[PDB]
Amino acid sequence: SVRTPKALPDGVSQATVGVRGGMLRSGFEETAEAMYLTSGYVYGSAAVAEKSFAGELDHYVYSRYGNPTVSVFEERLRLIEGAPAAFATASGMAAVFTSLGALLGAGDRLVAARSLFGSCFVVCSEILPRWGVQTVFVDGDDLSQWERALSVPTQAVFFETPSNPMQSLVDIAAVTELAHAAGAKVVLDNVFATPLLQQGFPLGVDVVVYSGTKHIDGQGRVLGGAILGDREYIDGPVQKLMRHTGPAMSAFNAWVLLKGLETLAIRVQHSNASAQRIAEFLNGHPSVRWVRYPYLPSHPQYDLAKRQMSGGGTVVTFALDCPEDVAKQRAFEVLDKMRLIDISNNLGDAKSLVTHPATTTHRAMGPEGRAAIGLGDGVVRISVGLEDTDDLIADIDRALS
Amino acid sequence: SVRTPKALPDGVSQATVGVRGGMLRSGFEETAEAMYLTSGYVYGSAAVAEKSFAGELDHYVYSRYGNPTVSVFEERLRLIEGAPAAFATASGMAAVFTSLGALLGAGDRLVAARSLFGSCFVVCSEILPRWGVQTVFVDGDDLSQWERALSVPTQAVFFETPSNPMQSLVDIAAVTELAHAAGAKVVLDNVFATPLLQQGFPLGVDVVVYSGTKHIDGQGRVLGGAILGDREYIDGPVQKLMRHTGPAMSAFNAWVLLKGLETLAIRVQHSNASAQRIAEFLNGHPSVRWVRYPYLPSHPQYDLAKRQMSGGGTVVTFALDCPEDVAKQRAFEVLDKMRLIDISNNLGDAKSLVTHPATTTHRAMGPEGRAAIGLGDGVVRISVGLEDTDDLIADIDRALS
Amino acid sequence: SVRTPKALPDGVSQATVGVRGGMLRSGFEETAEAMYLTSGYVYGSAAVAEKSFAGELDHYVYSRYGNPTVSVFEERLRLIEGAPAAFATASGMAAVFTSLGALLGAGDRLVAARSLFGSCFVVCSEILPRWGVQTVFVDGDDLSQWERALSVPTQAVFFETPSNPMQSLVDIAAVTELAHAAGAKVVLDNVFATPLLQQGFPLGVDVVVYSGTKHIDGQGRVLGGAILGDREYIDGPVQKLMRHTGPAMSAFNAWVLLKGLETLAIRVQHSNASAQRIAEFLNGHPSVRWVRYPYLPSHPQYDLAKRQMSGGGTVVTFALDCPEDVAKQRAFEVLDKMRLIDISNNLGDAKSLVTHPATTTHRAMGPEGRAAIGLGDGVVRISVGLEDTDDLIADIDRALS
Amino acid sequence: SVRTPKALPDGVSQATVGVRGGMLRSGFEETAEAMYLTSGYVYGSAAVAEKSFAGELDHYVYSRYGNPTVSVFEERLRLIEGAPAAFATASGMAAVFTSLGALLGAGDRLVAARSLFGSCFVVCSEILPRWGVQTVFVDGDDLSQWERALSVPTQAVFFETPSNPMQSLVDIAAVTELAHAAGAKVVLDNVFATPLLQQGFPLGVDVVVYSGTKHIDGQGRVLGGAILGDREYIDGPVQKLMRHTGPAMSAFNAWVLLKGLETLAIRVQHSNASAQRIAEFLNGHPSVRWVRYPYLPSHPQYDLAKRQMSGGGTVVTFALDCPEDVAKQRAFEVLDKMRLIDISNNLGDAKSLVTHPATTTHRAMGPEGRAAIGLGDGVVRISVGLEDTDDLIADIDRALS
């Protein structure tokens, strides 16, 4: 059996598992993790090849669905999360589509939250219904809407919490109880919080999906994703789509991302603490009307955040205090005055970034769509990196004034 | 515009285009092609960000659907093929699934050849019909069967020629005429032949798909794919699925494969010549019942091969002279005796490889499914690489005797 | 001019420059740093090629002595350290040999401390004297020996502080004062401390050398090094040796190392605090005779450590309390009982490591030379990484007990 | 023993060795060669660490002086060349300096040809003499000049053949005889010719050095070098300098180069034949006064080239038929009129390149020194790649006319 990882002592913590969990060392006894850039494998005999295709031996067969470097990434993340099983993908969106596709054929039914990442909303509203799926949307923060949608038989439920940019929350445990009553499996997209700040499995969720592109990489280099869940689910319908539709993670990208996992704990710790300080600063500034951050007392669901998350995260959203007449122009002026923070759409990088949601991601849905979620022309979003917290505050203060 | 590549002089040949086509050099004037390992991009102002997101400027936005290193690979392949447009993918199977997914929603109709790569068969017969597609199979070599299937309105047609592993041929110009009369778009998988030996666009084909994993890489290092076709098709339904379901090619993999394209011409030429000699050797050997190779005069469709191919390829298939009930035992005996050729399930590598399809690549079909395409327990497939031709003939002669 | 980097706002801290200092973005405006795998460059005209070779333009010419990715690593490290100029090398030993060779021809004079890294001692005692250099050794902690050796004109002075494994110190300001009166340039090897815990330039050191292989990488992946000093020295005798003897840094390694520099601050902070706790735990343990760690108040040179260092570092040395005739057996027993920490001779990794110096680190010098410095068969050295401090203490306590 | 490579069948040809020589597959049985990006190694026990440091086991210890991936490159090149031993380096100039330095201390004597690569001349005339070496230069093509210089007991002899750009030759067999009678060791730099067109070891040469940056890579991507000679030389004085001065090859670079070795045979074959055709074209053009290429019958040393080389190489030198006082102006016009070939100083790339030696390659010589070797302002050098030969001839013809 060639896939058994190096054993760790009983009871080690999340940080230890990030540094050395899941390792598969060769006979050369290299300290750091090897990179197997190969698409295929060789066999000692024809009988061994037959047995490998049958599943009687765990010999590697083809990198589209199994590679020794990819195996290290999958096991390390599985142990950090506390999941039964895991499967790596080419991107975060490949993880979302394939996880849902594994649950939903033509004639099946999906109930989802409306406040989603742009591409996740397109998968749920257009792409899967073109293949015969029935999709119903609800406001994620309204349990009576969830209950109404789930009183007919349902195959799957999908949501993100917190949402982006408005940072609205879903009550995880309450929604999972309702979902199970209707026969559905619950898929949670956990990119905003990371596995350090929010754990869905102890709250009854069936499947958790990640983007590796964001905090896991941590430095903006490559793309990747992962699907996490039950052994039966991962080895069954998920494996089948992965093998035959081929949205496969590169062994090079796996190497980058498994090395990113070693410093995840300390990077999230520092950025969470920095974002908390920055939200408090913005909350006292005379040029600012309101701030949204889950661990700030002004948040409408502050009390729920304190029970289901261990920190607020690495993103702060806020509105400028000016007439709506000049709000777009004022927001543009603020972005253009930054000297340290870069103007960019991404999240989860060591470099700090700023964006104007209303004219980028949410420009499609138009004025009516935006006003329904409270997203005005004066709203700005900042993604907090690893720069000195006082250097960041100085750049923001100068940009506002 | 940042995306216009360095123009080559008029009338330059395929070899020249493979070495220097599609380049986009930076201000540093590097001779060799740069690798942009980034997931996102920055903007000079909030206005430029808004316009870029709207597609009003050609500034890069997010690497899941556009990256400067991926663009060099796409353009280089487009020019070698003679196609209107191209989109890179995570694997050859992601190119197959996504190309057909862009043409077929629930309620649409596909006519396909039966003689296919294992995973392509699974896509056509199980995966797409689960999402509501109606699939009809035919024997690719029977034009009267094509005629009967295409006598009603049809959305898509799919086939490989020559087929993997039986090397059955499909008359491209003739099937295309029938498909267009039914309103269908024709997708050709051109992996076995490569762009050097067979060109489908001059014969009326609408879409060509490739696996980068095979001859394009040439040395068995990484996975990749491509979809080639109309600007309307590539930029429309193809781009929608790519952006939102995310089976994205890594910028690292793109670098490996675009460098592989520089040597494709000379590598195919050498391996085509070597395969032809090996096929002639096998055709005279006492232990061999038959040989299938398109440029051997003994091939049942030799005349059609001469019509639509400039060479036979790099793979040789043969059957052992042994009754069917004990043929597996004899095949295993032969493969186990090889000392230079590796036992492996792959092709298109500089290293020569051998496999037994009935117990590996086509095990899933079952005894009845294999019988329908003529694939018995006595069949053996050899992929020919760059080693000395007489060294390879020596290893095979010894293994058979 | 193509080599001018993106300038940062006035007054930014060491943490901020490590994240985004020294970047040179292309016209594609990529967020993350690009990798230019090229050996050569091209020119728009013959006149430009002539000017470029004559050094009248700053256009790149050949990667053995200048490359755009290598320049980003050089400038980021130069910004962190506060040096006038920098040059990257293939390894730390390449930095040591080339820096000293730049100052020392046949007939020139070197004064060096005796307590050095194995390979550094071989360079000073054997390799340079074979080429005509006069080398005199002193005990690093004895200022009266420094005074006597530096009472005649001298070209170079070389030492490490703290030393490895006994962690003896050299008084930087006092030795620098004596060296300058003799006309000599002071070369400090600062690998043990890192630029985060000890800074030589404000104390009047002329040259600082680094191995990138250790804390700079931080995860045990690649080799590299650097030389930092005055503009005339780096561009003069150093440049000459680098161009023509060619111990060049690879652009791939340069990308690995520059991204490592982004997390250096938080990695060193955490490992230093962890090592302080481990030193205190060992100091109080009944199986332990003595501990050596510079920020432990019992260190014989504690007041000097507090004067020139801001933390003790990430390595802890100790001796077992047992009779010397059985100490080797006892040391081997302890190493063999570790179940989390790996047995290995390396330093500066996120993975914690343990070694026995008398049979590894300091094998060459024989038993008489080891006794001279107090390095008995009962001495053990631990390199502290990023695992949970409680999990590491548990592993050490089980191994001792 | 972990270092013994997979031996190939007896008597296999050079093409087969290039594809498969020197591999060391892991227990995962990867088809393609693995990349070990590690600086250090771990041990099973303290007793294994001790024996590994003592050289009693061949267990890897530290990547500055041994790594599994670097070993595959070393062994594959050694087998192609037919040498007793091999050691990889950071660049070709590192191979030159380290090979000579291992033979030459203060007081030792070197006899070298004058017509050397620029950096090679600096090593011999300035760098080594600064460290106490006596160096004497001769005209490489004059055997009596060799004979006089070698009547004094000598330690080392160094030369290149053919020279660049004038392509004069040295008689390998004759010079080697004269050197051995002086007790000297012969170092041949074989970069211009490659291992495939000229073999030094059968003619009594003691040491051969290579730059991997040129034809070995073949695509202009990375730097590297190698030293080949007797086992006791490689494991003695060479190893000592490599371990302690550290001009180390990166494991990433070693993967690039070992894979380029698989296609070396067919790439050299195609480029050599192409250059032959191009030399013949130029030799008949009305704008051209003369041509230098070793396999052109009108070369002044044609008979010698036929005796010691199997082809002329991939570089073509020529001079314009114009008055000397306008020659620089005319040459500049020709370079600036090219539309396919790039203006660049490099060699051995699949991309074809053009250079003007008098203002680049040989700038640091002055009018006086260029006249001595016949290098006028009208001389142009072309490096031939893998583009279609008739596409290259078309560009050159238009540029001349």
In this complex, how many residue pairs, one in chain B and one in chain C, have their CB atoms less than 8 Å apart? 82
Asked if residue D162 has a cis previous peptide bond (ω within 30° of 0), the answer is: yes
Q: Helices then strands (H, E): number in chain C?
A: 17, 12
> Quick one: A187 and A140 in the same domain?
yes
Q: What strands lie across the sheet with C288-292, from one edge to the other?
A: C288-292, C315-320, C379-383, C353-355, C342-343
| The token pair that represents A366 in the structure block | 């138009």
Torsional class of C246: left (φ above 0), alpha (ψ -120 to 50), beta (otherwise): left
Interchain proximity D43–C356, CB inside 8 Å = no
C380 pairs with which residues across the strands? C318
**Beta strand ranges found along C65-184 (DSSP E):** 85-89, 109-113, 134-138, 156-160
Convert A53-86 to b/e letters by CB count within 10 Å (16 or more is b).
Answer: beeebebbbbbbbbbbbbbbbbbbbbbbbebebb
Could you tell me if residue B95 is inside a domain? yes
> Quick one: D223 and D279 in the same domain?
no
Q: What is the DSSP string of B8-34?
A: PPTT--HHHHHHHTT----TT-BSSPP
Contacts of D68 in chain A (CB under 8 A): 28, 30
The CA-based angle A67-A71-A74, given to 5 degrees, is 135
- H helices of C22-109, in order, are 46-53, 68-81, 92-103
> Quick one: C187 and C203 in the same domain?
yes
DSSP reduced 3-state for A209:
strand
Helix (H) / strand (E) element for D282: namely helix D264-282
C87 pairs with which residues across the strands? C227
- B138 touches A at CB < 8 Å: no
Which residues 340-359 on chain B approach chain A with CB closer than 8 angstroms? Answer: 342-346, 355-356, 359
Residue pair C209/C92 in contact by the 8 Å Cβ criterion? yes
- What's chain A's Rg over C-alpha atoms? 22
Could you tell me if residue B1 is inside a domain? no
Could you tell me if residue D300 is inside a domain? yes
| A49 contacts: CB under 8 Å, gap ≥ 6 | A43, B343, B345, B355, B356, B359, B360
Q: How far apart are CA A161 and CA A169, in angstroms?
A: 5
Interchain proximity D387–B20, CB inside 8 Å = yes
Residue pair B92/B211 in contact by the 8 Å Cβ criterion? yes
- In single-letter form, the type of residue at position A350 comes to A
Residue pair B113/B158 in contact by the 8 Å Cβ criterion? yes
Which of A223, A249, A264 lies at the terminal end of a domain, its last residue? A264
| The token pair that represents D200 in the structure block | 């030094």
**Resolution (Å units):** 1.9
> Quick one: C133 and C153 in the same domain?
yes
D290 pairs with which residues across the strands? D319
| The token pair that represents D345 in the structure block | 């100083």
- B366 touches A at CB < 8 Å: no
> Quick one: D291 and D304 in the same domain?
yes
Q: How far apart are CA A40 and CA A50, in angstroms?
A: 15
- HSE of D326, CA atoms in CB hemisphere, 13 A: 7
Interchain proximity B31–C25, CB inside 8 Å = no
Interchain proximity B28–C255, CB inside 8 Å = no
- H helices of A83-134, in order, are 92-101, 118-122, 128-130
Helix (H) / strand (E) element for A158: namely strand A156-160
Q: How far apart are CA A6 and CA A25, in angstroms?
A: 8
Residue pair A71/A4 in contact by the 8 Å Cβ criterion? no
Interchain proximity C350–A13, CB inside 8 Å = no
Q: How far apart are CA D255 and CA A45, in angstroms?
A: 28
The CA-based angle B303-B307-B308, given to 5 degrees, is 125
Which residues 146-185 on chain C approach chain D with CB closer than 8 angstroms? Answer: none
Could you tell me if residue A6 is inside a domain? no
Helix axes C389-400, C264-283, angle to 10 degrees: 30
Say how many C-beta atoms besides its own lie within 10 A of residue A330's C-beta: 18
Q: What is the DSSP string of D142-208?
A: -HHHHHHHTTS--SEEEEESS-SSS-----HHHHHHHHHTTTPEEEEE-TTTHHHH--SGGGT-SEE
Convert B119-145 to b/e letters by CB count within 10 Å (16 or more is b).
Answer: bbbbbbeebbebbbbebebbbbbeeeb
Residue of chain D whose Cα is closest to the Cα of B10: D391
Convert A172-198 to b/e letters by CB count within 10 Å (16 or more is b).
Answer: beebbebbeebebbbbbbbbbbbbbbb
Interchain proximity A31–C394, CB inside 8 Å = no
- Structure determination method: X-ray
| The token pair that represents A199 in the structure block | 């754990």
- A38 touches D at CB < 8 Å: yes
Q: How far apart are CA D346 and CA D353, in angstroms?
A: 7
Residue to test with chain D: of C38, C91, C259, most D Cβ within 10 A: C91
Which of A219, A248, A264 lies at the terminal end of a domain, its last residue? A264
| A367 contacts: CB under 8 Å, gap ≥ 6 | none
Cα torsion at B251, B256, B259, B260 (round to 10°)? Answer: -130
> Quick one: C319 and C219 in the same domain?
no
Q: Which domain holds residue A286?
A: 265-401
Largest CA distance in chain D: 77
D209 pairs with which residues across the strands? D189, D227
Cα torsion at C29, C30, C33, C37 (round to 10°)? Answer: -90
Q: How far apart are CA B150 and CA A54, in angstroms?
A: 38
Residue pair D354/D346 in contact by the 8 Å Cβ criterion? no
Helix (H) / strand (E) element for C318: namely strand C315-320
Could you tell me if residue B157 is inside a domain? yes
Interchain proximity B387–D350, CB inside 8 Å = no
Residue pair A354/A382 in contact by the 8 Å Cβ criterion? yes
Could you tell me if residue A3 is inside a domain? no
Helix axes B46-53, A327-337, angle to 10 degrees: 110
Contacts of D29 in chain A (CB under 8 A): 41-44, 59-60
> Quick one: A274 and A251 in the same domain?
no
Q: Determine the distance from the C-alpha atom of residue C398 to the mean position of all C-alpha atoms in its chain, rounded to a whole number.
A: 32
| The token pair that represents A308 in the structure block | 């289901």
DSSP code of A127?
I
Which residues 253-282 on chain A approach chain B with CB closer than 8 angstroms? Answer: 253
Backbone angles phi, psi at A209, to 5 degrees: -110, 140
Cα torsion at C197, C203, C205, C209 (round to 10°)? Answer: 10
- In single-letter form, the type of residue at position A42 comes to V
Cα torsion at C234, C237, C238, C239 (round to 10°)? Answer: 80
DSSP code of B159?
E
Distances (CA, A) of D17 to D6, D10, D74, D89: 11, 11, 13, 22
Distances (CA, A) of B111 to B136, B187, B304: 5, 11, 22
Q: Helices then strands (H, E): number in chain D?
A: 17, 12
| D386 contacts: CB under 8 Å, gap ≥ 6 | B15, B19, B262, B263, B265, B266, D267, D270, D271, D274, D350
> Quick one: B18 and B59 in the same domain?
yes
- What's chain D's Rg over C-alpha atoms? 22
Q: How far apart are CA A109 and CA B25, in angstroms?
A: 49
Q: Determine the distance from the C-alpha atom of residue C196 to the mean position of all C-alpha atoms in its chain, rounded to a whole number.
A: 12
Q: What strands lie across the sheet with A353-355, from one edge to the other?
A: A288-292, A315-320, A379-383, A353-355, A342-343
Neighbours of chain C (3+ CB pairs under 8 A): A, B, D
Which residues 54-73 on chain A approach chain D with CB closer than 8 angstroms? Answer: 59-60, 68
CA nearest neighbour of C384 among C315, C282, C312:
C315
DSSP reduced 3-state for B368:
helix
CATH of the domain at B392: 3.90.1150.10
Q: How far apart are CA A58 and CA A233, in angstroms?
A: 19
> Quick one: C287 and C277 in the same domain?
yes
Helix axes A46-54, B327-337, angle to 10 degrees: 120
Which of D237, D264, D291 lies at the terminal end of a domain, its last residue? D264
Interchain proximity C346–D90, CB inside 8 Å = no
> Quick one: C134 and C59 in the same domain?
yes
| B109-113/B156-160 β-pairing | parallel
> Quick one: D126 and D179 in the same domain?
yes
- HSE of C352, CA atoms in CB hemisphere, 13 A: 31
Could you tell me if residue A354 is inside a domain? yes
The CA-based angle C371-C374-C375, given to 5 degrees, is 80
Q: How far apart are CA A210 and CA A218, in angstroms?
A: 13
| C16 contacts: CB under 8 Å, gap ≥ 6 | A340, A387, A388, A391, C8
Q: Exposed/middle/buried for D302, CB within 10 Å: 0-12, 13-18, 19+?
A: middle
Interchain proximity A213–B39, CB inside 8 Å = yes
Q: How far apart are CA D3 and CA D68, in angstroms?
A: 8
- A385 touches C at CB < 8 Å: yes
Helix axes B264-283, D264-282, angle to 10 degrees: 120
The CA-based angle B252-C210-C350, given to 5 degrees, is 60
| The token pair that represents D306 in the structure block | 């036929």
Contacts of B108 in chain A (CB under 8 A): none
| A166 contacts: CB under 8 Å, gap ≥ 6 | A115, A292, A317, A373, A374, A375
Backbone angles phi, psi at C344, to 5 degrees: -170, 150
Residue to test with chain A: of D26, D63, D67, D69, most A Cβ within 10 A: D26
Q: How many domains does chain D have?
A: 2
CATH of the domain at B128: 3.40.640.10
Say how many C-beta atoms besides its own lie within 10 A of residue A401's C-beta: 10
Residue pair C35/A256 in contact by the 8 Å Cβ criterion? no
The CA-based angle C118-C119-C120, given to 5 degrees, is 90
- What's chain B's Rg over C-alpha atoms? 22
Residue to test with chain A: of D23, D29, D51, most A Cβ within 10 A: D29
- HSE of C175, CA atoms in CB hemisphere, 13 A: 30
Could you tell me if residue C44 is inside a domain? yes
Interchain proximity C331–D46, CB inside 8 Å = yes
CA nearest neighbour of C155 among C103, C225, C81, C88:
C103
Q: What is the DSSP string of C232-276?
A: HHIIIIIHHHHHHH--PPPHHHHHHHHHHTTSHHHHHHHHHHHHH
Asked if residue C162 has a cis previous peptide bond (ω within 30° of 0), the answer is: yes
Residue pair A314/A384 in contact by the 8 Å Cβ criterion? yes
> Quick one: D87 and D146 in the same domain?
yes
Q: What are B258-261's contacts with CB under 8 Å, separation 24+?
A: B258/B22, B258/B33, B258/B69, B258/B72, B258/B73, B258/B76, B259/B33, B259/D219, B259/D221, B260/B212, B260/B216, B260/B217, B260/B218, B260/B219, B261/B18, B261/B73, B261/B76, B261/B77, B261/B80, B261/B216
DSSP reduced 3-state for A382:
strand
Q: How far apart are CA A365 and CA C202, in angstroms?
A: 57
Q: What strands lie across the sheet with D225-229, from one edge to the other?
A: D85-89, D225-229, D207-211, D185-189, D156-160, D109-113, D134-138
Which residue is it, tokens 């991936």? D69
Q: How far apart are CA B227 and CA B232, in angstroms?
A: 13
Say how many C-beta atoms besides its own lie within 10 A of residue C45's C-beta: 12
Q: What strands lie across the sheet with C225-229, from one edge to the other?
A: C85-89, C225-229, C207-211, C185-189, C156-160, C109-113, C134-138
Asked if residue D165 has a cis previous peptide bond (ω within 30° of 0), the answer is: yes
Say how many C-beta atoms besides its own lie within 10 A of residue C231's C-beta: 10
Q: How far apart are CA C246 and CA C241, in angstroms?
A: 7
Say how many C-beta atoms besides its own lie within 10 A of residue A297's C-beta: 10
- H helices of B284-350, in order, are 302-308, 327-337
Residue pair B107/B132 in contact by the 8 Å Cβ criterion? yes
